[PDB]
Write a protein that binds this DNA or RNA. Structure first.
Ligand SMILES: [Mg+2]
Ligand SMILES: [Mg+2]
Length: 754
DNA sequence: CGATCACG
DNA sequence: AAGGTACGTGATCG
């Protein structure tokens, strides 16, 4: 009746209850369902076996687990009818307890759909789609500033400012006197945290926007709330924000709301060497943002001087986080709806996992038994499966062309699907060029069928946009057709994704083989037009007209795409991505370009990370600037020769030689003792409370042996007594950072010293 | 070398 | 207050 924003489950008297969080004509509504039961499927060697199989037992929470009910069902598997048994369980946590007991059984051929989280199982099976309708959501951006000193335990320093922003403006809560109109002064860290809780409960936002709140703002708020003995009842059910382990990093959920962390979103959507809020804001809104570094914040807080500067930075962090959230949420909301899963989960997923959620829902709709995810063995074998070289030098006036909108059409016309591949007793088939894979034409494949529907749906949205005089629906429909384009263009890549259920190596190669015929046509037609192709990948190409005027290159390129699209049948489409003033290419997905506005765009080259020393990062940025901004590779080579000589002669300040690496576990848990851990053990031995989250700063000293034995804690480094390892900083830091870039110009590691 | 570890 | 724990690249260890 309203708009679904999330779904989860609660346990009551040992039984699961599904919770559906809704927004209905401006109001928060929570619907409960007690009737949905967890299940798996089992393919048996013979029907007789069910009598033995239904009697399988497990143990969970001290008590035994049973198969509640069994049901024989007819489904489709590998494009063939299949008879399997639906095995019902009492609680979803029963599934991981009993699934291997069922799989182990001598009469069970295989088990299926045994790793689908219960709340997602519910949404699929009940045919429920989140984010449908015109329902208007409310938003709040939240940020925090902490007092930090070098290499402190996560949460030792207090939170000193909390900022938030809305359409009503950006505000700061602090516990020191600062005279600014947007600053609220409270008495303590405890009262500042309680004020944020009060702001969230009163504003009752549907969406809480953060910039990396999954790993910084919420874990820190929770750590300080713990130390202070106070609760954070931010959930609409008064629950505290909940930390979820996603990879090695975290994910924070706020119940009844959408915690929208922009950090994974922006990282997926745009290409930047660093994802600082300042770099991101400038990239999206073309406006500069000032950074106030942690050491400046500590100095201002401790001295009590220059606090206005810190409060302005805190306020801007919230204000720009609000603006970025409003910019990036509409597309995440349309992707959620398209795949039929909540924004929380979708905003945190790869495109491959978006495809899998879309396929799982469509598989239920079409009574198609879903394949299983590969085991560790199969996953590694897929990674091991096997399926031009760029022009050297510095090129000017580079035009970029995108091929990606070609592949969905190839999958559909050739019926490329795992269920149509090398079918026995097939009457008509398509044979892939060179590779020779045969795709049955007798029935539309599961994937080609879905893709066709997706593409038809996009054409209908586009037709509705041309015929619409309402700018509000035109905006919404624009996000919708874009969301379809993103999902449709992810299928080619998905066929080759090693963790995919509907993984198909032969599908991916066949699509590559058929796609190549069009790529060779584009290449030939460009070359006859005077263009030189500098780089080609399955995704696109880069070309120039050697020694031509920039507007002439653009005009001819724009005319070229207009022409090719008129020659290519159907929905096969070439796209002019952009233009670059300069660029160079090293190998596949290793290149660097500069646009006409001076913005450097690189792929697979930059080392902007804390585990690389400043000297290596500084040298790399300088080499890229000499090449792209100055068009001078000889300047770049001289930069490297000068830096290495300076390292040899001990002319580089020790602060530019520090390496930072986080401690992620108790020190005794390490299998390999890397330099940061060798340093950490020595600190612990000295009485330092070494805990996970600590970031270890070290300098590699001159000497015999591996680097771990020669690493020193930065706080212990004495320039008089210690001598850094110049050979380590030259060969393991500086030269690796620049050798890949310079290789594009004919230099070897050996050519970059005197 | 393969295993282990960390970055964003 | 559930809920399977990404992914891909590169460096140093053992
Ligand atoms: Mg959830
Ligand atoms: Mg901040």
């Amino acid at each position: 009746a309203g708009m679904i924003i999330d779904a989860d489950y609660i346990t009551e008297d040992g039984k699961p209850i599904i919770r559906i969080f809704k927004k209905e004509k401006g109001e928060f509504k929570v619907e409960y369902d007690r009737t949905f039961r967890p299940y798996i499927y089992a393919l048996l060697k013979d029907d007789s076996a069910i009598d033995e199989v239904k009697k399988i037992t497990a143990e969970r929470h001290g008590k035994i687990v049973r198969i509640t009910e069994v049901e024989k069902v007819q489904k489709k598997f590998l494009g063939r009818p299949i008879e399997v048994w639906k095995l019902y369980l009492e609680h979803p946590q029963d599934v991981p307890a009993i699934r291997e007991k069922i799989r182990e059984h001598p009469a069970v051929v295989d088990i299926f759909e045994y790793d689908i989280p219960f709340a997602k199982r519910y949404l699929i099976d009940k045919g429920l789609t989140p984010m449908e309708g015109n329902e208007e959501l409310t938003f709040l951006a939240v940020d925090i500033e902490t007092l930090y000193h070098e290499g402190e335990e996560f949460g030792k320093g207090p939170i000193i400012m909390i900022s938030y922003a809305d359409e009503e403006g950006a505000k700061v809560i602090t516990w020191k006197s600062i005279d600014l109109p947007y600053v609220e002064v409270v008495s303590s860290e405890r009262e500042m945290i309680k004020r944020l809780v009060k702001v969230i409960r009163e504003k009752d936002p549907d969406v809480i926007i953060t910039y990396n709140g999954d790993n910084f703002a919420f874990p820190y708020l929770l750590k300080r709330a713990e130390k202070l003995g106070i609760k954070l009842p931010l959930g609409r059910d008064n629950s505290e924000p909940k930390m979820q382990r996603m990879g090695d990093s975290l994910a924070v959920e706020i119940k009844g709301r959408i915690h929208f962390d922009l950090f994974p979103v922006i990282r997926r959507t745009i290409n930047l060497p660093t994802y600082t809020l300042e770099a991101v804001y400038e990239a999206i809104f073309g406006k500069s943002k000032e950074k106030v570094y942690a050491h400046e914040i500590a100095e201002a807080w401790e001295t009590g001087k220059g606090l206005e500067r810190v409060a302005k930075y805190s306020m801007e962090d919230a204000k720009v986080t609000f603006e970025l959230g409003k910019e990036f949420f509409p597309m995440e909301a349309q992707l959620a709806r398209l795949v039929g899963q909540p924004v929380w989960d979708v905003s945190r997923s790869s495109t491959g996992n978006l495809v899998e959620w879309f396929l799982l829902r469509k598989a239920y709709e079409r009574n198609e038994l879903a394949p299983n995810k590969p085991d560790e063995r199969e996953y590694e074998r897929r990674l091991r499966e096997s399926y031009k070289e760029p022009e050297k030098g510095l090129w000017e006036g580079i035009v970029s062309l995108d091929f990606r909108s070609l592949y969905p059409s190839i999958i559909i016309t050739h019926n490329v699907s795992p269920d149509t591949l090398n079918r026995e007793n097939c009457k008509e088939y398509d044979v892939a060029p060179q590779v020779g894979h045969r795709f049955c034409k007798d029935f539309p494949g599961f994937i080609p069928s879905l893709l066709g529907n997706l593409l038809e749906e996009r054409q209908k949205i586009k037709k509705r946009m041309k015929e619409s005089k309402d700018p509000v629906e035109k905006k919404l429909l624009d996000y919708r057709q874009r969301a379809i384009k993103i999902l449709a263009n992810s299928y080619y890549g998905y066929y080759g994704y090693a963790k995919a259920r509907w993984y198909c190596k032969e599908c991916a190669e066949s699509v590559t083989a058929w796609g190549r015929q069009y790529i060779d046509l584009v290449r030939r037609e460009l070359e006859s037009r005077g263009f030189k192709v500098l780089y080609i990948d399955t995704d696109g190409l880069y070309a120039t007209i050697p020694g031509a005027k920039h507007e002439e290159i653009k005009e001819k390129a724009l005319k070229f795409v207009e022409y090719i699209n008129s020659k290519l049948p159907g929905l096969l489409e070439l796209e002019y991505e952009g233009f670059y003033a300069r660029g160079f290419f090293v190998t596949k997905k290793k290149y660097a370009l500069i646009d006409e506005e001076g913005k450097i765009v690189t792929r697979g080259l930059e080392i902007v990370r804390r585990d690389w020393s400043e000297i290596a990062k500084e040298t790399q940025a300088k080499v890229l600037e000499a090449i792209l901004k100055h068009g001078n590779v000889d300047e770049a080579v001289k930069i490297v020769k000068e830096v290495t000589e300076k390292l040899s002669k001990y002319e580089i300040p020790p602060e530019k030689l520090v390496i930072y690496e986080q401690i992620t576990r108790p020190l005794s848990e390490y299998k390999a003792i890397g330099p940061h851990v060798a340093v950490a053990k020595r600190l612990a031995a000295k009485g330092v409370k070494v805990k996970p989250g600590m970031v270890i700063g070290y300098i590699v000293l001159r000497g015999d042996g591996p680097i771990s034995k020669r690493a020193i804690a930065i706080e212990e480094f004495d320039p008089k007594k210690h001598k850094y390892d110049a050979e380590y900083y030259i060969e393991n830091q500086v030269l690796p950072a620049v050798e890949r870039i310079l290789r594009a110009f004919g230099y070897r590691k050996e050519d970059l010293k005197y």
